[PDB]
Design an enzyme around this catalytic site. Sequence first.
Site, PDB file in Angstrom:
ATOM      1  N   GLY A 239       9.784  -1.710   4.745  1.00 44.96           N
ATOM      2  CA  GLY A 239       8.358  -1.520   4.865  1.00 44.96           C
ATOM      3  C   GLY A 239       7.736  -1.837   3.531  1.00 44.96           C
ATOM      4  O   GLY A 239       8.369  -1.690   2.483  1.00 44.96           O
ATOM      5  N   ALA A 240       6.519  -2.324   3.565  1.00 43.16           N
ATOM      6  CA  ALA A 240       5.901  -2.682   2.309  1.00 43.16           C
ATOM      7  C   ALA A 240       4.425  -2.367   2.379  1.00 43.16           C
ATOM      8  O   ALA A 240       3.812  -2.384   3.448  1.00 43.16           O
ATOM      9  CB  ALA A 240       6.128  -4.152   1.937  1.00 43.16           C
ATOM     10  N   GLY A 241       3.882  -2.041   1.218  1.00 37.92           N
ATOM     11  CA  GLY A 241       2.455  -1.932   1.022  1.00 37.92           C
ATOM     12  C   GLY A 241       2.120  -2.503  -0.336  1.00 37.92           C
ATOM     13  O   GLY A 241       2.989  -3.024  -1.041  1.00 37.92           O
TER      14      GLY A 241
ATOM     15  N   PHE B   4       1.178  -0.862  -3.016  1.00 41.10           N
ATOM     16  CA  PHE B   4       1.498  -0.011  -4.157  1.00 41.10           C
ATOM     17  C   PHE B   4       2.941   0.463  -4.177  1.00 41.10           C
ATOM     18  O   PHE B   4       3.305   1.279  -5.028  1.00 41.10           O
ATOM     19  CB  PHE B   4       0.526   1.161  -4.238  1.00 41.10           C
ATOM     20  N   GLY B   5       3.773  -0.058  -3.292  1.00 36.88           N
ATOM     21  CA  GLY B   5       5.174   0.292  -3.272  1.00 36.88           C
ATOM     22  C   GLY B   5       5.776  -0.227  -1.992  1.00 36.88           C
ATOM     23  O   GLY B   5       5.090  -0.808  -1.145  1.00 36.88           O
TER      24      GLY B   5
ATOM     25  N   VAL C 239       9.095   0.616   1.079  1.00 38.55           N
ATOM     26  CA  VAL C 239      10.100   1.480   1.678  1.00 38.55           C
ATOM     27  C   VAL C 239      11.363   0.653   1.825  1.00 38.55           C
ATOM     28  O   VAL C 239      11.320  -0.465   2.359  1.00 38.55           O
ATOM     29  CB  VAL C 239       9.637   2.016   3.042  1.00 38.55           C
TER      30      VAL C 239
ATOM     31  N   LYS D 158      11.187   5.403  -0.886  1.00 33.80           N
ATOM     32  CA  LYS D 158       9.829   4.876  -1.005  1.00 33.80           C
ATOM     33  C   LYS D 158       9.458   4.893  -2.480  1.00 33.80           C
ATOM     34  O   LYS D 158       9.682   5.893  -3.157  1.00 33.80           O
ATOM     35  CB  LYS D 158       8.828   5.702  -0.217  1.00 33.80           C
TER      36      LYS D 158
ATOM     37  N   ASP E 219      -2.622  12.607  12.298  1.00 33.69           N
ATOM     38  CA  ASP E 219      -2.276  11.238  12.670  1.00 33.69           C
ATOM     39  C   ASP E 219      -1.041  11.223  13.546  1.00 33.69           C
ATOM     40  O   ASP E 219      -0.153  10.382  13.360  1.00 33.69           O
ATOM     41  CB  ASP E 219      -2.140  10.340  11.434  1.00 33.69           C
TER      42      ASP E 219
ATOM     43  N   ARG F 277       3.788   5.724  16.322  1.00 35.79           N
ATOM     44  CA  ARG F 277       4.069   4.978  15.103  1.00 35.79           C
ATOM     45  C   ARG F 277       4.480   5.883  13.936  1.00 35.79           C
ATOM     46  O   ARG F 277       5.051   5.388  12.946  1.00 35.79           O
ATOM     47  CB  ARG F 277       2.896   4.071  14.705  1.00 35.79           C
ATOM     48  N   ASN F 278       4.164   7.181  13.996  1.00 37.25           N
ATOM     49  CA  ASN F 278       4.501   8.119  12.927  1.00 37.25           C
ATOM     50  C   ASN F 278       5.638   9.053  13.284  1.00 37.25           C
ATOM     51  O   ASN F 278       5.854  10.055  12.566  1.00 37.25           O
ATOM     52  CB  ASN F 278       3.255   8.891  12.486  1.00 37.25           C
TER      53      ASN F 278
ATOM     54  N   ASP G   2       5.174  11.230   8.073  1.00 39.16           N
ATOM     55  CA  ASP G   2       3.870  10.831   7.537  1.00 39.16           C
ATOM     56  C   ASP G   2       2.996  12.013   7.196  1.00 39.16           C
ATOM     57  O   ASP G   2       2.139  12.423   7.969  1.00 39.16           O
ATOM     58  CB  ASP G   2       3.162   9.881   8.485  1.00 39.16           C
TER      59      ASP G   2
HETATM   60  C1  LIG Z   1       9.201   2.021   9.454  1.00 39.41           C
HETATM   61  C2  LIG Z   1      10.178   1.382  10.432  1.00 39.41           C
HETATM   62  C3  LIG Z   1      11.530   1.610  10.153  1.00 39.41           C
HETATM   63  C4  LIG Z   1      12.005   2.860   9.772  1.00 39.41           C
HETATM   64  C5  LIG Z   1      13.340   3.068   9.486  1.00 39.41           C
HETATM   65  N1  LIG Z   1      13.831   4.259   9.132  1.00 39.41           N
HETATM   66  C6  LIG Z   1      13.226   5.096   8.271  1.00 39.41           C
HETATM   67  N2  LIG Z   1      13.789   6.273   7.975  1.00 39.41           N
HETATM   68  C7  LIG Z   1      13.043   6.974   7.081  1.00 39.41           C
HETATM   69  C8  LIG Z   1      11.895   6.390   6.613  1.00 39.41           C
HETATM   70  C9  LIG Z   1      10.915   6.864   5.716  1.00 39.41           C
HETATM   71  O1  LIG Z   1       9.838   6.256   5.663  1.00 39.41           O
HETATM   72  N3  LIG Z   1      11.141   7.969   4.941  1.00 39.41           N
HETATM   73  C10 LIG Z   1      10.150   8.431   4.070  1.00 39.41           C
HETATM   74  C11 LIG Z   1      10.288   8.253   2.680  1.00 39.41           C
HETATM   75  C12 LIG Z   1      11.392   7.578   2.151  1.00 39.41           C
HETATM   76  C13 LIG Z   1       9.298   8.729   1.804  1.00 39.41           C
HETATM   77  C14 LIG Z   1       8.186   9.388   2.321  1.00 39.41           C
HETATM   78  C15 LIG Z   1       8.071   9.595   3.694  1.00 39.41           C
HETATM   79  C16 LIG Z   1       9.042   9.111   4.580  1.00 39.41           C
HETATM   80 CL1  LIG Z   1       8.881   9.401   6.302  1.00 39.41          CL
HETATM   81  S1  LIG Z   1      11.753   4.797   7.403  1.00 39.41           S
HETATM   82  C17 LIG Z   1      14.245   2.018   9.613  1.00 39.41           C
HETATM   83  C18 LIG Z   1      13.784   0.753   9.994  1.00 39.41           C
HETATM   84  C19 LIG Z   1      14.559  -0.409  10.030  1.00 39.41           C
HETATM   85  O2  LIG Z   1      14.341  -1.244   9.153  1.00 39.41           O
HETATM   86  N4  LIG Z   1      15.467  -0.707  10.937  1.00 39.41           N
HETATM   87  C20 LIG Z   1      16.009  -0.041  12.081  1.00 39.41           C
HETATM   88  C21 LIG Z   1      16.950  -1.108  12.594  1.00 39.41           C
HETATM   89  C22 LIG Z   1      16.127  -2.348  12.941  1.00 39.41           C
HETATM   90  N5  LIG Z   1      15.220  -2.052  14.059  1.00 39.41           N
HETATM   91  C23 LIG Z   1      14.279  -1.014  13.604  1.00 39.41           C
HETATM   92  C24 LIG Z   1      14.983   0.243  13.141  1.00 39.41           C
HETATM   93  C25 LIG Z   1      12.430   0.567  10.235  1.00 39.41           C
END
Ligand SMILES: CCc1cc(Nc2ncc(C(=O)Nc3c(C)cccc3Cl)s2)cc(C(=O)NC2CCNCC2)c1
Length: 292
Positions: free
Chosen positions: A16-18, A20-21, A23, A42, A135, A139-140, A153
Site C-alpha cells: 500500500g502506498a500514500g 507520506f509513507g 505499507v 507502515k 469509517d 475496505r477497513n 484503521d
Molecule cells: C491493504 C490491502 C492488503 C492488506 C494486507 N494485509 C495487511 N495486514 C495488515 C495491514 C496493516 O495495514 N497494518 C497496519 C499497520 C502496519 C499500521 C497501522 C495500521 C494498520 Cl491496520 S495490511 C495484505 C495485502 C496484500 O498485499 N496481499 C494479500 C495477498 C494478495 N491479495 C491481497 C491480500 C493487501
Amino acid sequence: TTEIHPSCVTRQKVIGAGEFGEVYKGMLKTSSGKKEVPVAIKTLKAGYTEKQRVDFLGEAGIMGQFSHHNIIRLEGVISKYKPMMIITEYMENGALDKFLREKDGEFSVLQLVGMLRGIAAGMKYLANMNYVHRDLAARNILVNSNLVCKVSDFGLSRVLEDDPEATYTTSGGKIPIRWTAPEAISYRKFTSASDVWSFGIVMWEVMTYGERPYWELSNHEVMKAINDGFRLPTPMDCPSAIYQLMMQCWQQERARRPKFADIVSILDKLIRAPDSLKTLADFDPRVSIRLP
Ligand SMILES: CCc1cc(Nc2ncc(C(=O)Nc3c(C)cccc3Cl)s2)cc(C(=O)NC2CCNCC2)c1
C-alpha cells in the site's frame, strides 16, 4: 507501546502506498532463538509535520490499548529512529472488500455470517471501550488465513482524512456518504449507533460479495433516497434473519437501532443453530427470463 529496533524489521514488498509513507509486508525478528514472523509495516517519511506525527503515532497508541481477537494487533513501533514505523500482525488475505470481490461465490452462507459475527464482536469491544470508528466499511476490515475478520484503521481525525471514499460535503465535512448514518451526515453526530448503521452496510457488502452500496447512485442521490425512506434491497441468497438485522441497523431514529451487544447475540445464535440461515429473504429480480 513496545519499541522495536530497526534491525529487527525487514521490509519485503510494498502492499500500500500514500504520499507520506507506505505499507509493506515484511518480517520481524525479536529474539535470536525464535523464527521471524510476518508483519505489516507502515512508515512515515521525513519532513512529516507535528500533526502528521501525532496522528501517525496516535493510531499506534489507540491500537495498543486494545486486546481483542477481532481488532488488528500491534507488534510495536519504531519511534527512536527515522523513518518511524508501526508494525502489526500481517493479515494474509488483505482488505475484506477486495477479498470478497476476488472470491465471488466461493463461501458458504455460514462462512459469510461468521465473518459478520467477528466484525460485530470487534465493534462491540470498540463501542464498550468508548471508541467510535466513523469509517466502518469492508475496505477497513482485514482478513487472515483463518478467515478471521479484524477491524482496522484507527485514529481521531486521520481516518476520514486519509480515506478517498470520504468526500467533502456541501457542509464542509469529509465523510464516506454511502456508509454513514443520517445524523452523522446531517449534523456530524458520530457515535457507536452511527457505527451500527455502517455495520448494516458492511453486512450488505459481505452478503453481496463486495457490491458497491447503492450501485451507481451519486452521493446526493443516496442521501435523498435514505431521507425518502428507501433502503438497500435484499442481496441474492440472503438469510431472512440477516436481512432483517441489517434493516434494523438502518433505522432513521438512532435510538431504535440495535446495540452491538444485540447484534453479536443474534449472530451467535444464528450460527449456533445454522439451519436458521436456510430460510432466505425474497430477492427482487431486475431482469425477467421467460422460456416456453
Ligand atoms: C491493504 C490491502 C492488503 C492488506 C494486507 N494485509 C495487511 N495486514 C495488515 C495491514 C496493516 O495495514 N497494518 C497496519 C499497520 C502496519 C499500521 C497501522 C495500521 C494498520 Cl491496520 S495490511 C495484505 C495485502 C496484500 O498485499 N496481499 C494479500 C495477498 C494478495 N491479495 C491481497 C491480500 C493487501
